[PDB]
Amino acid sequence: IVGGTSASAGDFPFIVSISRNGGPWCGGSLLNANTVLTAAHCVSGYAQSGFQIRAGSLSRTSGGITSSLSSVRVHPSYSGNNNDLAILKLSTSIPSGGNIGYARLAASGSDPVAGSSATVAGWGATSEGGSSTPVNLLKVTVPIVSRATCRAQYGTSAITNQMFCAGVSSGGKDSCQGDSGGPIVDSSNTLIGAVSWGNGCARPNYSGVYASVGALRSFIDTYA
């Protein structure tokens, strides 16, 4: 997260860190006791044994509750950056309570309204291409950018109806490498997307691009 502040305990009860090969990698959202939602590109085709999920902590490396993976299912229409969601099943079920809870999802068919305020969180870099990442979870609030403006930035075909955008025209506030798969919420803390892709991090005139929960509810609901 670029331009962020520390998350407080309980800010995102459902957030998980996803380590790979013992190191930082992605974020995700706990949907129920045995299921995590993340970005497809975090997991697709990689050895599943490399991943460890941690819930209930502001850190990736201690606290809360961990699990390995039992299975991985990417969206059936995943291609390139498009439809960048995956359902992970956990080897160890994770109960709600305390600072752990399950995500509430954006309504089917919803689409975040341009100019509304969203909050994204993760353990990724604090600068583009940064090598160091923070121990504790960061968050940042940015406005939704219309799909039309996002298509002006990236190209018409590049931004689909299963993506939405968020960021500030001047840059300086964004998700970044290592934040992929983690949550972006609306002002009510409802899960509206997963961190997906963008041109660098926090650059002027290049929004962050998110996989849209409102657009991808059929997949999520079927397999959660």
Side-chain angles (χ1 to χ4, degrees):
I1 301 288
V2 178
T5 63
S6 45
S8 297
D11 275 354
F12 311 98
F14 55 84
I15 197 173
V16 303
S17 62
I18 305 182
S19 311
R20 186 182 171 212
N21 295 321
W25 186 247
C26 279
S29 297
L30 194 63
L31 301 188
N32 58 58
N34 73 329
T35 309
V36 165
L37 185 66
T38 191
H41 77 263
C42 293
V43 291
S44 182
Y46 297 131
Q48 291 181 11
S49 56
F51 295 100
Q52 185 178 71
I53 279 46
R54 183 184 301 277
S57 186
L58 294 171
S59 177
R60 177 189 68 83
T61 57
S62 50
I65 302 296
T66 59
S67 183
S68 306
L69 300 187
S70 58
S71 71
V72 173
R73 183 185 296 269
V74 307
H75 192 285
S77 300
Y78 180 47
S79 179
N81 298 143
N82 201 15
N83 307 313
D84 191 13
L85 289 181
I87 289 284
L88 318 182
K89 297 290 170 172
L90 303 184
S91 300
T92 304
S93 294
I94 303 183
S96 62
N99 286 311
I100 303 175
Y102 306 137
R104 180 173 166 146
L105 303 179
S108 181
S110 62
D111 186 18
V113 175
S116 65
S117 287
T119 300
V120 59
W123 292 270
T126 57
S127 62
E128 182 180 331
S131 292
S132 297
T133 57
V135 166
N136 304 103
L137 184 63
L138 295 173
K139 62 182 185 180
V140 67
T141 298
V142 284
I144 303 298
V145 171
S146 68
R147 188 169 297 94
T149 293
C150 205
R151 284 174 172 156
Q153 299 174 342
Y154 289 99
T156 299
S157 298
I159 312 302
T160 71
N161 288 351
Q162 306 80 228
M163 300 172 193
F164 72 88
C165 302
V168 301
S169 287
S170 66
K173 287 186 169 182
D174 202 356
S175 52
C176 198
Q177 278 58 68
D179 293 319
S180 289
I184 179 163
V185 297
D186 69 15
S187 57
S188 305
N189 286 324
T190 300
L191 186 67
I192 57 171
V195 177
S196 181
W197 67 281
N199 184 30
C201 310
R203 293 188 183 179
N205 299 307
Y206 289 97
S207 303
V209 191
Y210 296 86
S212 177
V213 166
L216 296 172
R217 282 294 299 275
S218 181
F219 170 69
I220 298 166
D221 296 351
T222 297
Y223 294 108

